[PDB]
Ligand binder design. Sequence first.
Ligand SMILES: Cc1cccc(Oc2nccc(-c3c(-c4ccc(F)cc4)ncn3C3CCNCC3)n2)c1C
Length: 127
Amino acid sequence: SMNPPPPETSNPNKPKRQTNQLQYLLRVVLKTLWKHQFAWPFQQPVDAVKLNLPDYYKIIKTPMDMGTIKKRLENNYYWNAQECIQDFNTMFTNCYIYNKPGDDIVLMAEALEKLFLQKINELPTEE
Ligand SMILES: Cc1cccc(Oc2nccc(-c3c(-c4ccc(F)cc4)ncn3C3CCNCC3)n2)c1C
């Protein structure tokens, strides 16, 4: 079972913006999760070949990872904060769907998600 192409990070005809909320999602949210000791499995698309998970992309039909989110934010790919928040939530949900409670990867996702939620709680009002 092969790896699919990664999610889109560039699309010139897609409408996109910089908003103060999206700037916060890069400078605070992404930066905080990316530096965490448990970030590494989430910093790029899941390599189902190298990890020997031939079922991964048969089960996970909306893949997402922080490498992709990082490129999207750096490329100003998003229209709004909700689109980016959805990508994070998709990432965590995929992990919980594929794995089982108490697995190392789930504990790692849970730690990152706790911080994500703490930072989103302080999302600035749009300017
Ligand atoms: C605990 C462990 C053991 C073996 C390899 C690992 O590294 C790793 N790297 C990328 C993805 C995953 C991963 C995800 C994963 C990671 C990020 C994501 F966004 C979605 C799924 N879901 C399950 N795994 C592994 C597959 C092999 N058996 C252990 C669990 N794990 C990890 C950490």
